[PDB]
Symmetry: C2
């Protein structure tokens, strides 16, 4: 009532698109099964207006939907016999000529849950289910959502309202949490960290008896939907709440303290997922404070969780550097610090690495760490909340970008060593690995601030489940389930989603150099915003050219962190892709791109044209008036207008800055304010 | 105990610098007199180790210090007979050949208070008082201190600790307030606003019975020291706390509400000073919200205070403008909005105008409003807290700058129309006028963050009392009273104070263009920090030149706001002073200054040399080790080292930015990072 159902609308079908089912055969009664059955009942009731009775044994003459695991089957057919993944499932229509029967067979209860959501997805999409033969197994073992929620209700980099978990340094008194779990589970998400990785005072206590009871009831809900719960922890907890004099991972007492803490947590949460950790910080002691490396820091926590089966999600966070020193390169830090530690991390430690080596910029090359540590589990994080991609004011469907990252061939083991094979664990046989996304939700009625940003959460789940899914089909699924099957609506909103990222990049930072945003809140144009800061985020634009020389020949030597094939491509000025040119080379404004445009003219072109493309997004949306409910139609239109106006600011600020510096006018004579 | 006595040290004199007094003749017993006597007793006891008995009638044979007003005198001599100002006083040694008698004669009790502090000042300075003949009358009627303290304890732009007035949305349970009052009164300050001009939720209630009792006891203390209390108010109070539907100054009920509020305040504070007001704001209704002008807005409040004798301190606050439009000029706003309203303001309304038309930058030309409104009371505000002048990390004695402003001849009535004559009311016969300073104090033990910043508070008071005092004598007075009379200490610290402003300006914004600071907190270099914002603070630096064209001939026409003499000086490229060139003209980097330096080389010169000058400040201070107590010696050294390091950052960031844009190298080949 207070919020949208997002893509789980289960809109009532017309009289010609219904199914005839009299019973739902639930072979089990576990908490997950109860949630699964409830979801099926809700979907069939809302969509088909039918209320099949729930039974535990098939009625030979009734049209039924059978739910169970291989173990509950009478005749285990070949197809389901090939299932090896615990979360895998099979859906097949009985080939008999009698009653209509749909079999949703999962390897485990979780598999049945995902199978039912898949079945419900087919119904929402209006697919013919008369002769189904489906087998699905997730590619990534860990498909996680990371929350940056604080207990005071705020969300770090949250642009969709306040936390739905906390308020006034306490837990909110849980219906929305259940619906959130339903949404996550519908797209296969099986893990979640509920609190900000930057753990503050109150949040540090989430691992104590004071809050564990509340954390436990939240975990109880997520469990019913196959979701394991994680907590971000304060490495200095032994000091702050443990009464100990040090936080040193090698200190005997500190080690004991964490083991007892883990034991305590599992008493409340038997299947606790583990800890998400950002180990050094600038205001509290961390591993480096005592001269310990990342392996020593991570392994201590891993040892505390090991007896319970917990995992340590270790943030590969390596702050000030001098803008004066062009030999130092922030982009090289992650690889330089962790690559040497390969093989020294415990088996239940997973290094969390961002898609790029900097910080979720509109475009960044792939983190060199992927493919470089065959002996260390790795998990890629992407950012669903649009910190540097429009903050849900500007539309930006991130799926296309994530696919470019996932399909990037690292050539770690020769051709066919794509990032997705690295993180799904197949390339190096990782015990634990996967993908994570920083949540883009909040208390706003539409969950994500921008109605269309719901596609990024949905899309993240889809890719996490199977990176091979196309951006086109993912967008199609989301649009149809969320706005219906009207041909124009589908084609239009899909086009909007698929073109959005490129459009936003067009009027923001050029050719992969990134940044150029206002400091602090990171929203809006400010070319020199961090140009002279100690954050190592520089473009080095001067009156003659721009770009970071990251070549081995004359620059920072960052290209060498990639395997030979990619190293050479980026190293050479003539082979380096235009879209990443300024991230790898410092070139004159007159340098001609593969597109034929000079670097400076390219800047003007994409910025002027990006705004016109944004105007098109709005125009195409306006043409759908009458085919979308008034509330959502206006919610989105308001945002698109905000986008258009801001795009004009991005366009002009950037064009003027570069005109003022280069002195080179726009080839086409468009308006550049002096 | 918890804080420094600042300049009221009253250090014990040696055996050869003492005075012989047996009695203090206090002719009156008012609260002010009791404070006055206590101060004299404290000073004489600490400095002279004597404890004269306090009596009400002179003892013909006793060495005495006589305190009283003309009315208490037996033989009213000529000198004191010339006193016309209520706060004026005379100090003279009896010319008899018998007992030693010092007469401190004031026009009113306040005059006696200021006379005693003057007498105590002479003692601290070691002046010969055997034959005194002194007459003093303050030039400015209003000598005010404005606090930006918030009730949650924070201080907007406060760099010396938390508020000494508030904490946890309440008043602090008052000894420091008394000592603060003593400090203010010692330098003649007679008015104070205790809360932030930006009035928030809790602060809005300072005008209600809930807090008035506390405000009253604070006011009681200040009264004993001749200080009138003011409150900053929320123009939208009728809505927020009055339960009214509008804040419109023309609304009959709103007008009544303010009258009743004033009446209520005076019941608690009979001599309440009035309101400090910033009338429109962006989150609450103000005069402009209802289409009313500044006169209508200010006069409504003036009418509420008029029956009680209260005054309305109206902030001349005129926010977004477009950086694209070079015809619009923020510097012109104040004059354009208020000049036309001259003569429409009630007599008890005083327009508060900043020394400059922008916002307390290291250097700004004088606000054109001074001298332009002969029919409207005007008060100049200066900023003691160093928002854009080092934030008390960098040393910056602001007295020299304030004197340049006060001595600026507006030629409003021909030669001899200096700003000081405008604000002291002599030029236009203003009923109420003066000067105000934004407080630079906080809870820090040394009150001002930087020990030497105590000189800015002291210095503000001295100038407020008599703008004709030289920066040299003011610095001398402060150094001697605060650190003693050692020849080297005096000469060194004085040199440091007197050179500090120019040094800081040398490595910050060039030739009066201002800004070039980090957005938000405003500390540190960021040349383009606000270059593309909507704040109207631009330098327009490009690859060929820099500066704002404010000329009538080709620019914004700002020069015309000054009278002919100054208008012409700034209008012409060859006569415009170098120090303000970039504020008035946009010129090529190769433009040659009166100094012979090109604009670009001047930038390099002052930035490289400014850092070397900062290093000198530290060097000269280090040479005083052993002649200053260890605590204060190290407190200051720590800050000077912080200054040196930051100056290096200012130097390099600015030099690199301009090298990158101009392409012109440093004439002397000093290190500029590419």
């Amino acid at each position: 009532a207070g919020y949208e159902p997002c893509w789980l609308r289960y809109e009532r079908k017309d009289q010609y698109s219904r199914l005839r089912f009299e019973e739902i055969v639930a072979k089990r009664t576990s908490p997950i099964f109860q949630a699964v059955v409830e979801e099926l009942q809700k979907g069939l009731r809302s969509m088909m207006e039918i209320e099949p009775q729930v039974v535990q044994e098939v009625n030979e003459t009734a049209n039924s939907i059978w739910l169970g695991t291989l173990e509950d089957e009478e005749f285990e057919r070949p197809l389901e016999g090939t299932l090896v993944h615990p979360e895998g499932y099979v859906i097949r229509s009985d080939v008999d000529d009698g009653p209509f029967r749909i079999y949703i067979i999962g390897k485990t209860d979780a598999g049945v849950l995902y199978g039912v959501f898949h079945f419900l997805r087919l119904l929402q999409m209006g697919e013919n289910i008369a002769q189904l033969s489906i087998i699905e197994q997730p590619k990534n073992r860990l498909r996680m959502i990371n929350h940056w929620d604080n207990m005071d209700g705020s969300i770090e980099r949250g642009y969709a309202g306040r936390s739905i978990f906390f308020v006034d340094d306490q837990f909110v008194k849980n219906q929305r949490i259940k619906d959130y779990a339903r949404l996550l589970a519908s797209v296969g998400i099986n893990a979640i960290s509920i609190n900000n990785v930057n753990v503050h005072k109150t949040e540090t206590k989430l691992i104590t008896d004071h809050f564990l009871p509340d954390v436990a009831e939240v975990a109880d809900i997520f469990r019913t939907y196959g979701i394991k719960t994680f907590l971000s922890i304060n490495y200095a907890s032994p000091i702050e709440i443990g009464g100990l004099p040090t936080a040193d991972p090698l200190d005997p007492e500190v080690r004991r303290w964490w083991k007892e803490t883990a034991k305590r947590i599992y008493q409340y949460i038997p299947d606790f997922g583990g800890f998400v950790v950002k180990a050094d910080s600038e205001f509290r002691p961390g591993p480096f404070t005592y001269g310990r490396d990342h392996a020593e820091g991570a392994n201590m926590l891993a040892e505390a969780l090991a007896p319970f089966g917990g995992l340590v999600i270790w943030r590969c966070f390596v702050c000030q550097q001098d803008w004066r020193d062009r030999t130092t390169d922030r982009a090289k830090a992650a690889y330089d610090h962790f690559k040497p530690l390969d093989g020294q991390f415990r088996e239940n430690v997973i290094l969390q690495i961002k898609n790029g080596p900097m910080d979720f910029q509109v475009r960044e090359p792939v983190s060199p760490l992927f493919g470089a540590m065959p002996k260390t589990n790795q998990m890629m994080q992407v950012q669903i909340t649009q910190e540097y991609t429009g903050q849900q004011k500007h539309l930006c469907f991130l799926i296309p970008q994530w696919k470019e990252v996932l399909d990037f061939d690292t050539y770690a083991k020769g051709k066919g060593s794509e990032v997705k094979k690295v993180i799904d664990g197949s390339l190096f046989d990782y015990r634990y690995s996967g993908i994570a996304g920083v949540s883009n939700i909040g208390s706003d009625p539409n969950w994500t601030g921008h109605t269309l940003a719901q596609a990024n959460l949905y899309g993240f789940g889809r890719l996490a489940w199977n990176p091979d899914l196309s951006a086109e089909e993912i967008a199609n699924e989301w649009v149809v389930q969320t706005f219906g099957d009207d041909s124009q609506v589908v084609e239009t909103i899909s086009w909007m989603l698929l073109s959005s990222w490129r459009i936003y990049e067009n009027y923001t930072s050029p050719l992969g150099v990134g940044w150029m945003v206002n400091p602090g809140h990171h929203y809006g144009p400010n070319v020199d915003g961090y140009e002279y800061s100690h954050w190592g985020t520089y473009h080095y634009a001067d009156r003659d050219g721009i770009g970071v020389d990251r070549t081995v020949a004359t620059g920072t030597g960052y290209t060498a962190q990639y395997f030979p094939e990619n190293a050479a491509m980026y190293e050479s000025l003539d082979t380096c892709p235009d879209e990443l040119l300024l991230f790898f080379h410092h070139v004159p404004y007159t340098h001609r791109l593969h597109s034929g445009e000079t670097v400076i003219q390219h800047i003007y072109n994409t910025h002027f044209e990006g705004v016109e493309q944004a105007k098109q997004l709005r125009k195409r949306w306006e043409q759908l008036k009458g085919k979308i409910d008034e509330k959502r139609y206006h919610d989105v239109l308001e945002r698109l207008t905000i986008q258009v106006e801001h795009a004009k600011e991005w366009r002009d600020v950037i064009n003027t800055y570069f005109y003022r510096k280069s002195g080179i006018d726009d080839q086409y004579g468009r308006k550049i304010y002096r």
